[PDB]
Structure formats: C-alpha cells, structure tokens
Curated annotation (Swiss-Prot), chain A:
The keyword Transport applies. GO terms for molecular function: ATP binding; proton-transporting ATP synthase activity, rotational mechanism; proton-transporting ATPase activity, rotational mechanism. Signal peptide: none annotated. Pfam families: ATP-synt_D. Belongs to the V-ATPase D subunit family. The keyword Mitochondrion does not apply. It comes from the Bacteria. This is V-type ATP synthase subunit D. One of its GO terms (biological process) is proton motive force-driven plasma membrane ATP synthesis. Keywords: ATP synthesis, Hydrogen ion transport, Ion transport, Transport. Produces ATP from ADP in the presence of a proton gradient across the membrane. Transmembrane segments: none annotated. The lineage of its organism: Bacteria, Thermotogati, Deinococcota, Deinococci, Thermales.
From Swiss-Prot, chain C:
It comes from Thermus thermophilus (strain ATCC 27634 / DSM 579 / HB8). Produces ATP from ADP in the presence of a proton gradient across the membrane. Keywords: ATP synthesis, Hydrogen ion transport, Ion transport, Transport. This is V-type ATP synthase subunit F. Signal peptide: none annotated. InterPro entries: ATPase_V1-cplx_f_g_su (IPR008218), ATPase_V1-cplx_fsu_bac/arc (IPR022944), ATPase_V1_fsu_sf (IPR036906). GO terms for biological process: proton motive force-driven plasma membrane ATP synthesis.
UniProtKB/Swiss-Prot annotation, chains D, E:
Belongs to the ATPase alpha/beta chains family. It comes from the Bacteria. Transmembrane segments: none annotated. Produces ATP from ADP in the presence of a proton gradient across the membrane. The V-type alpha chain is a catalytic subunit. This is V-type ATP synthase alpha chain.
Curated annotation (Swiss-Prot), chain F:
It comes from Thermus thermophilus (strain ATCC 27634 / DSM 579 / HB8). Belongs to the ATPase alpha/beta chains family. Transmembrane segments: none annotated. It comes from the Bacteria. Produces ATP from ADP in the presence of a proton gradient across the membrane. The V-type beta chain is a regulatory subunit. This is V-type ATP synthase beta chain.
C-alpha cells in the first residue's frame, strides 16, 4: 500500500522507534501519576478521620443545644440568621487537566443581638462552621483524587492501545516493505545472471 | 568489549570500571527524566531525580564538551568524580565505600 | 451549598448559616438536587450515605460538563456513632478507581 | 547481530534443534548468573525422559518440576501489579508467591560458576533444594490463613538455611536435607 | 528517481561535497519555500569561515548562529512529544520553545523569491532578524520565569513587526531595526 | 467450506448445523466483549453482557481444553448444549425451538 522504497523503510523504522520510546515515556508518566495518587489517598483517609470527629463534635453540640433548650428557639435562632452566600472558587491546571477548587467566606459579622439568647447555639454554630470547613476540605481532596484516577485510566488505555495497535501495524508494514525490496533485489540478481550469460555466449560464437 | 581487561590493578586506576558503569546508568536515567520533565514540570518530581536532571544537563557540557585540551586520564577521572559529586552519596549504588570515602565529595 | 440527611440536621445547617435540606428518599433528594443544580446554591452538595452514596446520576442528568456541583457522601447523625467504613471504603475506592485491589 | 530471532539462521536452527536456552543481557546485568531466561526458553525432551527420572531421581519428580514451572509462571504473570503499584501493597495470597519466587531465583536457580562446591549439582541435590522450597510454599500457604500474615513469615531462620543450602557438598547433603525439612515442619507449628 | 536519497547518484555525490541541502516534499506541499529539510541538511564550512564572519558581518555572529541552531534542534527534539501527546497538557516553558520555532520558520527561513524585496537578503539583514528573534526568546523566557501566560505572549503587537520584518528594504532596515529592537525591549516590562 | 453436506439427518444429530452456528456467533460476541473490557471499565455492561463473558471463558476452558480424552460426537454435542444452557433462551437466536425443547436442560 505505502510506497515501497528504502527511504520509506527508514521512515517506518523511525516511527517504530518513536512509538517504542513513547511506551517507555508514558509508562514513566503513569508511574509519576501513581506516586501522587498514593500520596493523596492517605490524605483522603486523614481528611475523612478529621471530618468524622468534627462531625461528632457538632452533632453532640446540636444534641445538647436542642435537648437542654427549645426546638422553637433553635428554629428562631436558625431562621433569624440569613443564608450567607459567598463561597467562591479558583482553578487548578495541572497536566493540562483543570478542576476548580473552592473555599468559603463564612461571615461572622451577623452578630444578631450579640448577647445570644441561648447559651449554647454560639458553641454549636461555630462547631457547624468548623464542620463545613472540614467538609469543603474533603470535597477538594475528593475532586483532586478523581482527576488523578481518571487520568491514570486515560494513560493506561493510551499505553495499551498504542502498544497493541501501532506497534504491530508498523511491524507489519516494515516486513511488507522489506520483502518487496528483497523481491526487487532478487530480480536484479537474476537479470545480471542472464546478461553475463549472454555476454559469455559470444566467445562461444566465434 | 575489552574495557574489562584494560582497567584495574595497576592498569590505569583501580576504581575505573565501577565509575564507567555508574556514569552510564546515571546518564541513562538522566536523559529520559529530562525528556519526561516537559510534560510534568520542574516542580512535580522527587528531589534526587532533579539532581539527576542537573547532573545530565551539566554532564553533557563538562564531560563530553571537551574542546581541544590534551585531557589526561587522571584529569578526566577527576572531572568524572566532580560530576558524580552532584549526586547524593548512598545513591551511588555501584561503588563500595572504599573508593567513595577516598575520592567522592570534591567538586 | 446543600446538604441532605434530615431537615432536622438541615435546620442545624441553617444554624450554621448555609442552606440544607432533607428528603428521606432517593428520588426526592435527586429532584431537589436537580433544581439545586438548575438554580445554584453555589454548587457544592453532600448527601447522606444511607440516602445516596453516589448522586452522580444527577450530574449526567443535567450538567455533564465542568463537574461544578461536587457531590459528597456524608456520615449521618444516626450513623456517625460508628465511624462508617473508612479503611474498607478506601479499599473500594482503589478497587473502583485504578482497577487493582491493593492492601498497602 | 540485532538481537532478533527472525533471521533464517535462527529460524532453521529452531526448526531442527530440540532444546533452546535464551541467554539475556538484562538478567546478567542484574547479577543473576546463569543468564538463562525461563520465559522464552523451552525444552522438548521432558516427555520422554520421564521414566528415567522416575527410576533414578525420585518417584515424584515431574510433579514438583511442574510445581516450580507453575510458580515461576505465576511470578512472571503477576509481576505487573508489583511493578505498577508497589510490592508492599500486595495481598497475602500473592505476596508469598512473590517471595517464594525470589527465594527460587536467589537460591535454586542462580549458581556461582566459580565456587568450589557450588558449580556441580547432581539430581539428588537439586531434588533436595527443590523439595525444601516446595515444602516451604505448601506449609506457608497452609499457615497464612489462621495465625499470621507475611511479616510473621519472611523472617524465620529456616530461610537462611535454604538460601545457604546450596554451598553443601554431596557427601554432607543427604543428612542435611532431612534436618532442614525437620526444622521447617517444626517451625511452621511453632508459629 | 524515486524521490529517495538512497540512490547510487545521491549517495555517491554526498561523500565528496560539503553543503548538502536535502529538499523534501512535505515542506513544499504547503507553499513554504524554499523547502529545505532542516533535519537532514549540513554544511562543512561553518568552522573555517568564522574569521570572515567576525571581521565582516558582526563580532558575535557565531554565537547568534549557534543559538539559532540549538533552538531549532530543541524544537525538533520536542516535536516527538508534541505529536505523541498533543500541544496541550504541556509545561509552559517549552511551548515557548515550540512557538519560537514556529515564528522562526515563519520569519527567518521562509522566503518568497517573487516579492520585490525579500528576494535578495544580505547578511546584515539576517543578523538583524536573528538578533530580534533571540532578544525576544531571551526576554520572553525571563518573563515566563517571572510567571505569566503564554496566550499573553502570542498576541503581542510587537511580533507582527517581526513577521513583517523581512519585507523592509535594505535601506529602511537600520532605522526599522532600531525601532523594532526598542519596542521589543520596551513591551515586556508592561506585562 | 463443506460441513453443510456432512451434517443433519442420517449423518449426525439433526441440530448439528444450528449448534455450530450458535456457538460461533456466541463466541464471536464473547471475544468482542473481552476486547471491550480491555478498554472500558468493568461496569459498562448489562447482565447478559457478563453472561457472554462467562460463556467466553467457559467455552475456552471446557469445550476446547480436553487434553487427551476421546470425545464422541454425542459427548461433544451434549457438552455444547450444557455450555449453551449457561445462556438465556432469548439469546438463542439461531436454534429452532424444538431442539431447545428436547435439550438445554
């Protein structure tokens, strides 16, 4: 199919050598991605540990602040507070891949009659504020780990695809071109035999 | 082929073959880490690998970039140890500590 | 920034000063999550682990791009008594994520 | 020349010869001598030397030859996840495959071709080393499930006697073998 | 005959000449003329002519020329990676290498013979263009180690000057060179 | 190219052509799915998808791997039926249904 010259054989040997370098380079890329994956999974463990312990703190704080107190007054203390929008995001570009990570403002300026009429909901409210800080921390850890995982999936199917597809196809074209060029050299070393035979059948015609 | 018969005890210098293998493996894993750093970045490796990257990049202009000076065998092994000093001791995992403690360290 | 275990916990989230909800069923939680992805609570949602572990069906429902509403499993107030699954949860994270099962 | 097995010299040779031992330069670079590679090397004479081995070596001999062939193929199979992930992060039903693979490749196969007592090795001695490694594998795979994991196995002073059992003269060996096997049968009960 | 420099003509005539200028078809399919394949051309007169270059064009001419050579070599070493992975998901300090290789192939090398100017180009004009290009690359890698975009480099109004800086005549080129050099020196502190 | 002459009534069992066609189509789809698992994850599948995976490995292990034994045409066809019994009858697009009624248990 492709034009069978000795130049094209060299181009095919060059691209076989480039794909064989590419298998090594992309395996090394996968190794660096696995290194940071296992650097992040134990951070995910520690983040889940801190999240559950601060979760237990805020849960016990709300248990005390609505068991020793009024459900109607925690209703009024919740609904007096505005919903407090303002969480924002920034951008990670690494290995090309891009995810937004977030952090929150969480304003404390809403000191709504700052002599707080129950003795407990300031304590429980700051417990839930620390709870939400730990939650957005676990969220950023989660999205970083998912990006690393899907990129290792990409690199694994890329290495497997490149190896199994475009190593043997290029090997097949190199063998095709080598065998047709050997046919041409065999026709040359036949035709030279005949022209030597029919120059030396001239001394034998004297 | 014959290098293993031409270096050693009273031939040129007794630590020769081990430095030969060590320079080979160190430039071998300097080249491909220098090629990988294009798609990951300078600041997203380990630390000894960036030492290997600096070693290879300075190796191919202090050791191969000879120019024209009549470089003797002791001077060339001396500069080979000055290049090996930029790798950390202990990471040189082809040489026993006799020639390490004797020769290594000096840039 | 919706969080869905109970409305009783969610009014505690209002006592923190962020919006939260409670559904006690799966499709109701995904529907309120769906209108929350539609009009944002700034797109950072956690759902109770005994309610929905993976709400990512809502991501592929509405917003397949940018992965902006990040969806999180979370330990409920009736479940945080036990310390949910952490080490086997990471086992199934590795099993889900890289294909291999490891011990480490 | 090129490091290829497609030239017609090697193809006609492999069509006619009966046993092939591919020597590698990598395995000789990892200081594993002999440099035979047990993956692309093959013999054909084993099917008809079988009654000779059952007469002169021992009556169970191709069974445990098949055992180490299967064991080295298991190691070379699941070397992939060791290479990607990390060897400590293995299971306990594959970590021991890895470690018996290492004790094979560092005591049984690897042979000093200059040592006084190591260079020659008859069939009874290779049978002895082979049976000790198989007995380690079987008693360890029995005992991994009830009281230990691999860190409570991989240091035990029988493994040093296996790894130094090959520097033993054959006038001293066939009493050394029974005592090393007796100590391993006592040791995996002492655990 | 085949369009293949593996003949008994070409590989009998490339052993007795210096200055071998291997063309190719791929650079001439798009109209990038002259289609000198840079990757396989050479000239054995670079060493023994640098005295004349110093005493007649400029004192630093070998330095600037060898820097042009090694930038083109570094580009053609990174073309491997950039066609095996893609020109996204890279580090920004080498996409400047590829884009400076792109602007040197679109400015310094590429020449139309039929335009009234740029047909002839004496070597002070080529020295001017190479000094522009390497002043740009030196101060651009400085400004990217300060930390900037690389979209922010590829849309400056300072390098349309460069892309037109082969079309000025050999009379305007001194004052044009002074003002383009001024603007390249003055448009990087404002990023 | 033959075996259309040498099957059928009075030469082998009646169902020989239909069993051969069904086993070939099933193992072609089995090796398709085993190619597919090499690319996409293990969860992009339906349930008879995994049944074709199981049939691919069960075919390659029990129908081919006989080692030494002297199988019949009878034992071969009933091993083919006990392999096809691992697949739903709705996946049996090829075999006419009275062979399924006499067999498949």
């Amino acid at each position: 199919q492709v034009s069978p010259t000795r130049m094209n054989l060299l181009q095919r040997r060059g691209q076989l050598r480039l794909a064989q370098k590419g298998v090594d380079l992309l395996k090394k890329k996968r190794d660096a991605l696995v290194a940071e994956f296992f650097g992040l999974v134990r951070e995910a463990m520690e983040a889940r540990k801190a999240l559950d312990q601060a979760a237990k703190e805020a849960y016990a704080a709300l248990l005390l602040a609505q068991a020793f107190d009024g459900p109607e007054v925690v209703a009024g203390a919740a609904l007096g507070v505005p919903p407090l929008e303002g969480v924002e995001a920034e951008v990670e570009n690494v290995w090309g891949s891009k995810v937004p990570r977030l952090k929150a403002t969480f304003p404390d300026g809403a000191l709504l009659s700052p002599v707080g009429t129950p003795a407990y909901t300031l304590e429980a409210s700051r417990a839930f504020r620390r709870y939400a800080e730990a939650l957005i921390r676990v969220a950023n850890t989660e999205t970083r780990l998912k990006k690393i995982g899907e990129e290792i999936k990409k690199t694994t199917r890329r290495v497997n695809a490149l190896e199994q597809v475009v190593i043997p196809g290029i090997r097949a074209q190199i063998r095709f071109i080598q065998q047709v060029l050997e046919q041409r050299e065999r026709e040359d070393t036949f035709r030279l035999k005949r022209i030597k035979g029919k120059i030396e059948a001239r001394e034998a015609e004297e | 082929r014959l290098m293993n018969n031409g270096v050693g005890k009273g031939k040129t210098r007794e630590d020769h073959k081990q430095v030969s293998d060590q320079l080979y493996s160190a430039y071998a894993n300097g080249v491909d880490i220098r090629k990988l750093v294009a798609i990951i970045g300078e600041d997203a490796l380990t630390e000894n690998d960036r030492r290997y990257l600096q070693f290879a990049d300075a190796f191919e202009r202090f050791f191969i970039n000879q120019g024209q000076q009549n470089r003797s065998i002791e001077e060339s092994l001396q500069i080979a140890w000055a290049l090996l000093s930029m790798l950390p001791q202990g990471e040189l995992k082809r040489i026993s500590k006799d020639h390490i403690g004797k020769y290594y360290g000096q840039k | 920034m919706a969080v869905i275990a109970d409305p009783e916990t969610a009014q505690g989230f209002r006592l923190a000063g962020l919006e939260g909800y409670g559904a006690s069923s799966a499709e109701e939680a995904q529907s309120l999550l769906e209108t929350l992805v539609e009009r944002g609570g700034y797109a950072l949602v956690a759902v109770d682990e005994a309610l929905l572990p993976d709400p990512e069906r809502a991501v592929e429902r509405l917003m397949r791009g940018r992965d902006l509403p990040v969806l999180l499993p979370i330990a409920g107030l009736k479940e945080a008594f036990q310390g949910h699954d952490v080490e086997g949860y990471m086992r199934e994270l590795v099993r889900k994520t890289i294909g291999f099962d490891i011990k480490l | 020349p090129g490091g290829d097995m497609s030239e017609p010299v090697t193809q006609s040779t492999l069509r006619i010869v009966g046993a092939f031992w591919r020597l590698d330069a990598s395995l000789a670079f990892r200081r594993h001598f002999p440099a035979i590679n047990w993956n692309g090397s093959y013999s054909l004479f084993t099917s008809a030397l079988d009654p000779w081995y059952r007469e002169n070596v021992a009556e169970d001999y191709p069974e445990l030859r098949d055992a180490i062939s299967e064991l080295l193929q298991r190691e070379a199979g699941l070397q992939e996840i060791v290479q990607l992930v990390g060897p400590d992060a293995l299971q306990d039903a594959e970590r021991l495959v890895i470690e018996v693979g290492r004790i094979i490749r560092e005591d049984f196969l690897q042979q000093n071709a200059y040592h006084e007592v190591d260079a020659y090795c008859s069939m009874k001695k290779a049978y002895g080393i082979m049976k000790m490694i198989l007995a380690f594998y079987k008693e360890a795979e029995a005992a991994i499930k009830r009281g230990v994991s691999i860190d409570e196995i991989l240091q035990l002073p029988v493994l040093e006697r296996i790894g130094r059992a090959r520097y033993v003269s054959e006038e001293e060996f066939p009493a050394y073998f029974e005592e090393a096997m007796k100590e391993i049968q006592g040791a995996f009960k002492a655990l």
